Every structure is written in C-alpha cells, then in structure tokens.
C-alpha cells in the first residue's frame, strides 16, 4: 500500500502536464476547418453545433479541476486547525472519478469518425460534412480513458485497503 500513493501522485501530475501543454493546440482549428457541401448560409454553424456540443478539452479541464476540490478543503481545514475528514474525502474522490469516467464513455465513446450526416434547419434535407484531425483526436481519447482507468483502480485499491 506504500507504492500506490506514489504512483497515484505521479499519474495525477502526468495527466495535468499532458492536458496543459499540448491539448490546447490540437483543437484550436476545430470550427475554422469544419466544412460542409452546401450553399446555404448558417448550415455550417448548425451542423458543427450538433456534431460537437461540448469540446473534449473543456470537459477534461473541468474534470481535472473538480477532482482536486477535496484536497483543497482538507488543506483549508488543517490550516485553520482529522481521520474522519480523510475517510470522507477519499470516498468523495472515488465517487467523483467513477462518475466522470462513466460520463466520458456516455458522451463520446471510443472513436471520432471522419464523416458526419446532418439534418438540422436551415440545411435542406440531409448534408455531408467533413472533420479535422480525426486520427489524432481518437488517439487522445483512448489515452485519456486509459489514464482515468488507472486512477480509478488505484483509488479503489486504497479504499479497500483501509476498509
């Protein structure tokens, strides 16, 4: 139960670094290079909005920030100043990380396809649109799912270790 802590800390820092340094620049051109075969004004806007409601990078930043709140609470408490608080914050972290992983699976799945079929007003009937960087975005998706799985496993390990 000694190394588990060390590896959890290392995984957390690794995830933060990967998200902070490179992820902001794969998605930079997401809408400027999204294009549809049509002459109707506003169809690109409607179809992009329907294909990508919340961007991956926004979801990941939110998750990263929200999984660090129990630690901040514990730190503020101790600064004003314990084991019951430790138990409760561990429970809360476990719950939050399982919820976020499940939500990721339900929102995005495991792949980003290259074509999208759209039927939203003002587009006439169904139109075909084309995505930017699908392979790189799929690789990023899979990597993030793997890291979050590792973190879930480790936190369950420690929860069951204490009992």
């Amino acid at each position: 139960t000694m190394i588990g802590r060390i590896l959890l800390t290392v995984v957390v820092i690794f995830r933060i670094l990967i998200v902070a340094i490179v992820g902001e620049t794969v998605y930079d051109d997401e809408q400027t290079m999204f294009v549809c075969n049509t002459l109707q004004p506003g169809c690109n806007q409607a179809c992009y909005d329907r294909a990508f409601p919340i961007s991956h990078i926004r979801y990941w930043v939110f998750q990263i920030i929200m999984v660090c709140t129990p630690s901040l609470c514990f730190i503020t408490y101790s600064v004003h100043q314990i084991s019951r608080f430790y138990i409760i914050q561990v429970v809360f972290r476990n719950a939050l990380e399982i919820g976020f992983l499940v939500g990721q699976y339900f929102l995005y799945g495991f792949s980003v396809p290259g074509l999208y079929e759209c039927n939203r007003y003002p587009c006439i009937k169904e139109v075909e649109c084309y995505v930017s960087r699908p392979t790189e975005k799929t690789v990023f998706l899979v990597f993030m799912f793997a890291v979050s799985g590792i973190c879930v496993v480790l936190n369950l390990a420690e929860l069951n270790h204490l009992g």
Copy 2:
C-alpha cells in the same frame, strides 16, 4: 458554522479558476462567425450589436472583481492598524452578490437561441441571423447561475448565524 467558511472559500476559488482558464476561448470567435442572410453593408455589425450588447465574459470578470473589494479594504485597514468593519463588509458583500445575480437573470435569462430576428438600420425590413456555439454558451450560463446561487445561500447563512 465552521464548514461554511471553508466551502465558501473553495467555491470562490473554483469560480475564479473556471472563469480564468477556459471562458476566454469559447467567446473568441463570437463576431467573426456571426453571419446574416443579406447583401447590405453594415447589417452584420448592427445586428450583432443589437443581439449582444455586453458579452457574458466581460460581465463575469467585472462581477468577480467587484465582489472582492471589501476584503481588500479590510486588509488595507488592518495593515495600517475591527468587528464593526467585519459586520459592515459582510453586509456589503451580501448586497453586492444578490444584486449581481438579479442583474444576470434580467440581462440574459436561461438560454441562448440559435436564431435571431433583426430589424435595425441599415437592414431592410427584418432579416435572419445565425449564432455560434449556442449549446456550449447555454451550458456555461446555467453553471454560472448555479455557482452564484450557492454563494448567495452561504453568505445569508453566515449573516443569520451572527445576527
């Protein structure tokens, strides 16, 4: 009344982080991707100005800065150097946060629609225009309203605790 303080501090820091890190980049393309069905020069400018008089991110930055002024005053006083000042600053913070929440509701409501109908000069009669990222902007609106509600509840809690 002990945990309330800790959670108020955590909510404040969380709100600042969310606004500072991601909000500047959802709104970056607000006017460059706003488009209207027309051939008249200046109609896009007039209709964008009428649809979005003050941007959300500007309003939120202003609110965040203004709700931290009583603390700065108290700090400057103590550095020159109390309970009466504490009472007064708590009262002022309560008033300011209720005012800002009410103003948010009256300025923006609870949703951002995808279409807008415009009848401002130099546009001839009424024209139809199309918005960028309405779903993401609606999600952001709802999240910010929820956070500000939490803060209002907590500050009223402490006000009534002291009495």
Copy 3:
C-alpha cells in the same frame, strides 16, 4: 480623513485591474471590422484615421502611467534619504488628474455613434461608414468617467483637509 486614503488606494487598484485585464480585447478588431460603402482604394484608411485619431485604450494607459510619477519620485527620494515634498506631490497629482479628466471630456464626449460621415481624399464627396461595438464602447466610456470623477473628489477632499 482616515477612510479616504483607503478608498483612494482601492479605487486606484480597481481601475488598474479593469484596464489591464479586459480593455485590450474589446478594441482588438477596431480597424479590421470598420467598413465603408465604396469601391475606392484607400478610403477606409482615411476615414478610419479621421474618425479615431487616438484610441481610448492608448489614452487610458498613458493617463494611468502618468498619474503614478509623483509617488515614484517620492520613493526614490526617500530611498536615497519630507513634508514639503508630500505637499508638492499632492498638488501635482491633483492638477494632473483634473487636466486628464477635462481632456477626456474634450476629446471624446459621452457616446460613440454607430454611423460616421466622411469627406476626406481619396473618397469622392461624402460616404457613410459603420462602427464596431458602439454600445460596449459607450459603456466603457461612462464607467471610466465615473471612476475618474470619484478620484478627483477624493484628492480634493484631502487637499482641503490639510489646507
């Protein structure tokens, strides 16, 4: 006369923060989204230059920097090292802030209109041009005038307090 100092310091810091964080990005697209109804090359340049000779944000940065010079002089003097210097620097600050407020009123007034009428070479006769974000720019103008008025009042207060 005790609280006046504290509120002057708070107003100064508030003004600096508002100018530094948001003002650089309302004006970013000032000339790229300025457009005139014409086919003559160079008319957009001439009409933009005649409508907006010095930008608001440039004027405000200059004013903010210039109203902090007496403090720097006093600090450098004391570091080399007094009441006469205090008197003189208070007088100078008062004069500078009244001059800057008067100049603001004479340069810009109280509103930014949406249309502008231009008759400068190489434009043939008179042409009509269209401005970006007039409502937001008007709001910013009014807010800055109010803050500077508050500062003027406080400094006159202290000047007359000492006498």
Copy 4:
C-alpha cells in the same frame, strides 16, 4: 564513469531547450499551407490526415515527458523517506528510451518528401498534394535522431558499468 553523468545531464537539458523554444513554430502552419490539386470539398482534410497522423512535435513532447517519470518517482519516495530503487529506475529509463527510438524510426524514417499521392474518399482516384517546409523538417528529424542515439549510448554505458 564520472563525466558520463555530466554529459547525460547536459544532453537532456539541451534537448528540452531545443524542443521548447523553436519547435512549436516550424509546424504552426502545417495544415493551412497544405494544398492539393482538386475541386472536391473535404479532400484536403482527408489527405492531410492520411499523410500526417501524429505530428512530430506532439510525439517529441510526449517522449520527453515520459522519460522523466522514474526520476519523479524516486524524488517522491526520498521525500517521504534506496539502491534497489536506483537500479530499477535505471533499467526502466534504458528500456523506455530504446523503445521510443525504435518507434520513431518505424513511424517516420529519415526524410520528409515534398510530394504525396493520395487515394482516400472523397477524393476521386489519385491526387497530388504539396507539403510545407520539407527541408527544415528533415533537418529537425535527423538532429533529434542523433541526440536520442547519444542518450541511448550513455545510458547503456552506465548500466554496463554497474552491471
């Protein structure tokens, strides 16, 4: 065996500096200046995605971050607090760097050509496309391969020195 350590540290810092300061700006225009001889919408997207699945700079940042994890683990352990850990981390670093060099060779090779032949839907039959900055990108490839080879040699040196 004394100088080997010093030169390994110098090589690592040199590599980090070269990657961090200049590499982000050779690749900035990679897709905006990629062009194909065609009139079909979406062909540029499909052909760019097939020619460049993962960008060099992304691969190099990932490798740089991943080769520094054993040191972070050792530091965290000692802070909580050894020779067995030293042995294991040396072994792991050796393995990781050999794996990354082999993967680089298998993904990219030793050159970036100026022409690319594409046959992916929606492109009709085979089309010809043109790359940006091939000579500079080839120079960067060769330099990075050389540096990583040096690092591999040094780490094997020390592994065999201890035995």
Copy 5:
C-alpha cells in the same frame, strides 16, 4: 544637482514602460493594411520596403538597450571588485544619447504622411499608396523626441556640474 538624478531615473523608467506596453501593437498591422492602386504582383512589397526601411519600434528598442550598457559594465566591474570609471561611463552615455537623437531626426523627421509616391521595379512608372494610422504614428514620434530631449538636457547638466 540632487533632484536631477531622481528625475533622470524616473524619465528612463517611464520611457521603458511606454515603449514596452503599447508600442508593439500600433505597428502590428503595418504591412497587412498597406495598399497600392495597381494590378502588378510584387509592387506592394517593393513600395512598402522603400517607404519603411527600418520600423520605428525596432529603432527604439535598439536605442533603449544600447543606452544601458555602461551601467551593466560598471555593475560587473564592481561585483568583481571607481571614480574614473564613473567619469568615463557618464561621457559615453552622453555621447550615445546625442548620437541617437541626431540619427532619429535624420532618419524620420517630425511627421508621417498619409500618401506615398513610388517608382520602384516591378511597378510601372509612378504609383500611389496609402498608409495606416498616420496621426497616431506622428503623435508617438513627437512624444519620443520630447522625452529624449529631456534626457539629453539632464545628462549635460550633470556633466557640466562635475566638470
């Protein structure tokens, strides 16, 4: 001779701040908004290059950096460790600042006109071109000349004070 030093330091810091914070963004669009009445490829490039050989902001940054070298030399000497060095560095600073002011006058003069007449290959005969932001650039020119004049006067003051 006491206040002269203080005001010289204040003028130097003021000049550095003005150059560093705002000057980089008046000149940002210098070539993208330069336009000529012609259909010949390469004429805009040739005429811009002939009208503006070295940009003002480049000249000012170079001057600012070069007028601070004697101080760095004196500091490095004292750290290794005097009045003779003080004399020599004062002389050198005086000479450098007079040279730079004279060069500014000879390179640029006192105004930036709105029209420019060009006769360089590949332009056929003489063509007319149009400049961006001439009034703002003229204001900046005059302000910088005034500041440099103040600095020259003060340094001559101190030189003649010591003798």
Copy 6:
C-alpha cells in the same frame, strides 16, 4: 586582460537580448507574404523552400544555445565537486565560435536580394518571385556578423594571453 572578460560578458548578454526580444517578429510573415507570378498550385511552396532552406532566426537560436554548453558542463562539475577543465572549455568555445561564424558566411553571405529566380517542379520553366523586408533582413545579417566577429577576437585574445 581584465576588461576583456567584462566586455565579453556584456557582448554575450547584449546578443542574447537582441535575439530574444525583436528577431522573432521580423520573420513572422516570411511565407505568408512570399508571392510568385504564376497560376500553378504548389509553386509558391517549392520556390520558398528552395530560396530559404533554414531560417536565420533558427540558425541564430541554435548557435546561441550551443555556445553556452561548456559553461554548463563546468558548473555541473564544480557543483559535484579545475584549471585543466578551464583550459579545455576555453579551447572548445573558441573552436565552436569560429566554426559558427564560418558556417554563417557560407550559408548566407552578406545580403538578401529582393528578387529570386526559381526553376523547381511543379513550376514550368523559370519564374520570378518577390521577398518580404529585404532591407531590414540585410541590416540584421550585418549586425549579427559584426557582433560575432567581436566575440571571436576577444576569445582569441584571452587564449593567447594564457598561452
């Protein structure tokens, strides 16, 4: 032999500052404002690549970083902890700086012309292309050559002083 050290340090810092602050922004538009008289797709890419294989700013950053490696080695050695190392590092620095100056002369020469003649596929026969900011780039070239010459002279001075 005392002042030589001081001036070498000052020259090195001056060179680093000049390269770091301004050079990144003269070359920013190098390819976006490069244009050729042709209707063939891909000719601009091929001709730009043949005219400018490695950019000046990349070469200068690499040289600056590489001429500081012996100092880092000496520092790391002393931290683990000498005159023999001093001798060797002086020799190495001399050699590296002479090599880099010779390479600069052989790669670029002393001027940047305004026209370039290109005959690379897919361009049909020979075409004429036009360069951005040739005068400013020539000035930068000459300045950098002068500085590097000064540094070479000083290092040879000290090498021969010790002997």
Copy 7:
C-alpha cells in the same frame, strides 16, 4: 366612311412595324438585369416569375396575329370561290379587339414601377428587388394602349355605319 378604311389600314401597318422592329430589343435583358438583395439561391427566379408572368412582347405578338385571322379566312374562301361573310368577320374582329384591350388593362394597368416586394419560397420573409428600364417600358405601354383605342373606335364607326 371612305377615309376610315384608309386610316384603319395605316394604323394596322404602323402597329405591326413598331412591334416588329424595336420591341424585341428593349426586353432582351429583362431577367439578366433583374436583381434582388439576398443570398438565397433560387430567390431571383421565383421573384422574377411572380413579378412578370407573361411578357408584354409575347402578349402583343399573340394579339397581332389573332386579330388577322378573319381576313385569312375570307381570303381562303374567296380563293376557293360573300356579304354575309363580310358582316360576320367584321363582328368577330370588333369583339376580338375589345376583348384584347380589356385584357391588357386587367393584366398590366398603366405603369411599371421600379421596386417590387416579394414573399415567395425559397425567399425568407419579404425581400426587395429592382427592375430594368421602367420608364421606357411605361412609355411603350401607353403608346400601345393609345393605338389599340384608335383601332377600336374606327371599327365601331364602320359597324354602326353599316348597321
């Protein structure tokens, strides 16, 4: 009753000549120079079709041909070969010319306006369109109405003369 015949023949020939020689070339550009303020494909087609269902020149050619049929019948009869036929053909000509004049008034009126307001699918709401050569077309309308009135009067004259 003698001159009436002569003038009827002269009016008929005059009308035929005017229609045949010039009318085909006022209307030649009717749809190519019809333009609407819109970006919607197909709106110009729908609005032109609704504004001008049958062109004037088509209506006039049809009328001219149809008012000459009784004469052809009488000629064919006499060639095969009477007063009863004369009576009947006079009656028929009278009826046909009164019908055609009434239909002209009910289809077109007395003027062609320069603006037209359109609300047909696929146009969004109401749009404004602009007509070619309205003054010339109005002059032609009035002239043709006058000529047809003269012819009606003369034929009624002769009908009542015989009785």
Copy 8:
C-alpha cells in the same frame, strides 16, 4: 363540310406562325438559368439532363415537320403525273396527329413545376433545383394542346364525312 377545310388550313398556318416566331426565345436561357443548391461539380449538368430530356420546342418542330409529309408526297406524285392516294394520305395524317397528341400527353402532362428533386450521380443524396419561367412554359403547353385537339377533331370530321 366546306368550312372545315378552310378552318383546318387556317389552324395549321396559325400554329406554324406561333411556333416559328416566338417559341425559340422563351427557351433560349433554359440551362444557363437552371441552378441547384450544391457545391459538387457536374451536378447541375446531371440534374438538368434528368429533368428535361427533350425540349418542348424540339418536339414541336419535329411534329410540325412530320405532319406535312403526305402533302409533299401527293404534290410530287401529281407533278410527275389520284383519289386512292387522297384517301390513304388522309388516313395517314389522322394516325400521325393522334399519335403525336398522345405522345405529348405521356411525355409532358399539363404543367411545369418550379421545384425539382434530383438524386443522380455525382450529386450526393437528394438535392433541390430551381426552374426558369415555369408559368410561361405552362401557358405554352396548354395552348399547344388545345390547338392540336382542334386539328384532331377536324380531321376526324372529314374522315367520317367521306367514310
């Protein structure tokens, strides 16, 4: 049975004149003003070809020429030179005119709609296209059907008169 001949001759000449003088110029812009909402090359060609396989004016010219062949045969026979030939040619004319009227009904129907829905390669799925002058073309269709009906009735009249 006397007038029937005269009216048949008059109807034939009237039909020829109407077709020859005006019909060539309603259809002149049939394909140049046919437009579809799409960005795919070749879709306009495929959809126009599927909507209008043989033009009305071509069909009518062919019919007019083919219904005059028996007369030419009879004339050539008599010039070389009968009642049996008269009978046979009357029979043939009757048959030909009934066949042509039936074919007209089966090819075109009674109206020309303003919209057409197309699903032919290379068009992606179904697209919407817009027709030129539908009301005028419908009027022409109905008029021609009426005239041909009159001719059919008259020829059957004479066939049954002889028996």
Copy 9:
C-alpha cells in the same frame, strides 16, 4: 424647284440607310458598360434609368417611321382611286418634321458628357457614374441634327413655292 425634290428624296434615303445599318451597334452595350462607384445593389439600375430615359436610336426609328405616314395614306387613296390631298399631306409633313426637330433639341441638346451625378434611391446621397462611347454618341447627335435641318429647309422651300 426641280432639283429640290430630287435632293429631298436623296436625303431621306441617306438618312434611312445610316440609321438602319450602323446605329443599332454603337448603343448595343449601353447598360452593360455603364458603371457607378458604389456597393449598393440596384443603384446602377436607378442611375442608368435616370440618365437615359429613352434611347436615341429608339427615338430616331420612331421619327423615321412617323414621317412616312402621309405618303402611305396618299398611296392607299390613289390605289383605291387629288391636289387637295397633296396640299394637306405636304402641310402635315412640314408640321411633323418641325415638331420632331424641336423635341430632339429639348430632349437631348448637343452633347453627351462622360460623367453623371446621381441622387436616386437606393443610392446613398450623391454618386458618380461613367458613360460608354461619349465622343461617338456626340458625333452621331450632331450629324442627325444637321440632316433633319436640311430636310426642314427643303420642305419649307416647296411649301412656299406653291403657296
């Protein structure tokens, strides 16, 4: 009085030939090459219509046809079949030709200028437009006025000869 008749006939035939052979092709591009400096849709149409209400060639064809009607009347009378008719038709021809010459002078004057100033809706304020072939059109105007003057003189000659 003998040659006057011959020359009148020759002048009439000459005028008809000049109008019929060349005049239809100077005016062919009248509206396609008319251009105004503006970006407003419909302004070219409104300004062309206001500058040229009835084209010269239309006016001249109408005049030529109308001055030949008395001859046709006299011919038809004589075919049915005198000096009184001769007198009356001479009087009528004189009156018609004087009326047409006066109307020409009042409609068009003696020149066609190259510039036109327009202030009709939808044009904003006053705009400048440019005419096609003004010199050729002026030459044609003057020639036609001269010919019509000759004809007027001759007809008055004969009228006064008979008395």
Copy 10:
C-alpha cells in the same frame, strides 16, 4: 419502282430540313458547359479536344453537301447540252452513301455517355469530366442513322431494278 423515287425525294428533303432548322442549337453550348474536376490550366481544352475531335453537326453538313454533287454535275451537263451519265451518277451516289454510313458507325457508334476519363497533358494522371445534353444527343444520333439506312435501302432498290 414508281413510289420509290417519290419517297427518296421526300426523305432527302426531310433530312435537310431537320438538319438545317434545329441541329445548330443543341450543340451551341458544347464547350462552354463542358467541365472537369481539376485546378490545372489547359486541361479542359485538352480533354474536350480528345473527347470530341469532329462535331456531329459538322460531319452531317459535310455529308449532306457531298451527296448532292452528282446531281449538280448532271444538271450542268444537261444545261450545256445521257443515260450512261445517269447510270454512273447512280453508282456514285450509292457508293458515297454507303461510305458515309459506315464512317458514321466507326466514328461515333450508337450512344453518347455522360462521363469521360481523360489522361492528356497537361492533366495530371487521370481526371473525370462531364458532358452536356447526352440524352438529346443520343436521340439525334439514332434518328440520323435510321434516316440514312432508309436512303441506302432505296438507292440499292433502284440500282437492282435497272441492273
């Protein structure tokens, strides 16, 4: 053998009329509406030239003119003025018409496809192009083949009748 002559004359006149009146206007837009999916200048020209070397209408006019030469020769002979000439001209006409029918089959076949695949310089590899009015052109081809077959049969009939 009596009717054969009459029907041959009727077929010849029918063919001439069909070719002369309508065929010139199906092919009018043959090259202006021919389009290929490419960005290479000159590819449309090369591919159109390879797909349609000699146009159908040119071939048919040439054939029609050449099959009437023996008659002109016989007429000129008789005007200067026989059975031997009749025999020879019949033989020649038979041969010419069989040759022309065979050549038609070998040049064009029985259909015009909608797509064409092109691989001629300057087109890169193989490109796809799209044809105008293929169904109408196929109908015309089949009709002309049928008529020419009828003529061949009749002329062989008469040749074998005389023997």
Copy 11:
C-alpha cells in the same frame, strides 16, 4: 479609256464586298478585350474613348455610302426624265474621294500600336493599356488605303480624259 470604266466598277464592288462580309467581326470585341493596369473604376472607359474616338468600320461605312450619292441623284433625274449633269457628278465624286482619303490619313495614319499611354481623369497620373488584334487591324488599314488610292487614280484619269 474603255477598260478604266470596267476596272473602276470592279474595284468599287470588290471594296463593298470586303467591307460588308468580314470587317464587322474583327472589331466586334474591341472594348470587351481592352484592358488597363489599374484598380480605378471608369479608367478603362475614359482611356478606350480617348484612344479610339471613331471606329474604322464606322468611318468606312460612312465613306462608302457617301461616295454613291451622285449616282443616285443622276438615276432619279433620268427616271423623272444630261451631259452637264454627268460632268458635275464626276467632279463631285473626284472631290469627295480625295477628301475622304486625306481625312483617313490625318485621322489614323499607317499603323495601330499594341500599347497606349493614358492620362485622363479619373485615372491617376499615367497608366498603360493593351490593345486587341493590332496586326490584323494594321493589315486592314493598309489594304483600304491601297484600294482608295487606286480609285482616286482612275477617277483623275477619266476627268483628264474628258477635260
């Protein structure tokens, strides 16, 4: 003096045929393919009008018509009905043809250059423009001058023959 008449008649008919059949189609694209290097609206119109005030074909048609008037006068006289009239008409024809040849030389000269230099408002300073078909137009000029010279010689021959 016998053949001179015959050759004069043949030359006249030849000239009429050459002018009537081909000259109308060399000049058809005179203004549509005239182009100037400029971005100013109206400059093409002004420069074309100044370069070509009256077109060659207009001048030649006018001359051809005017040199046939004496014959028409003589014919009309004889129809009403001599040697004195013959003399006078010969004199007049001689004078007219010499005048027209001299005017041709003074208006046009002997060549049409490919470049033209223009300095008319609204063109800024002097601009360069490019002509269509200069070699063909020069050939036509020379041919017409030669023919008119032949005619002048022949008419002088006959004038001096009679005396």
Copy 12:
C-alpha cells in the same frame, strides 16, 4: 476537255458552300478560349497576336473573292458589248491561284499544334499557352489545301489544252 469545265465549276461551288456555311463557327471562340499560365495583364493579348496574326477564315474569304474578279470583268465587258480577253483572264486566274496556294503553304504549313511558347513583352521570359480545337483546325487546313490543289491542276489542264 469537256468534263474538265464541269468539274471546275462544281469544285468552285463546293468550296464556296463549305467556307460560307460552317467555317464561321469553328473560329468564333478563338480568343475567348485562348489561355496562358501567367498573372501578368496583357500577356494573353500579346501572345495571341503573335501566334495568330491573320486568321484562316479571313485569308480564305479574301482568296475566294479575289479568284472571281476576272469573270466579273469579262461579264461587264460583254454586257457593254472577245477571245483575247478569254485568254488573258485564263492566264490571270492561273497565276492568282498558284500564288494563293504558295502563300497558304508559307503562312500556315500543314498542322496546328496544341502548345505555343511565347516571349513577348509584357510577358516575363518565356510562357506556355494553350490552343482551342487544334484537331478540327488541322482537318480544315488539309481539306482546303486538297481542294485548291485540284483547282490548280484543272486550270493548268485547260491552259495547256488551248496552248
């Protein structure tokens, strides 16, 4: 010598018909579909003028008209009214037709290539241009040469027959 006359007349009429009916419409788009790979204004004009100085159809019309002049002279002579004139006109016709055939060979040769290489001002160095309908134009060239050869042979036949 009897049939030779008949065949000469038939060949002449055949040639006139072929030239008059079809040749005017192969060359109609000669310059509108001529295109060069360049961005220089005026290069298309200069290169078209250098490639095609006099068009084939112009040359052929001129030749056809000029080879019929001796017949017109003989006809005019006989109308005023011989064997000597017959001899002379035969000689002249022979000479004219041989001259025209030789000139055709020297001006045009036997083929029209698809590419042309141009080096005329204002084109920079050498450019490549592309021709319209080369195969059809080559076929026309060869056919016309063959016909003119036949005519030459026949006229020499008759010349030598008389002797």
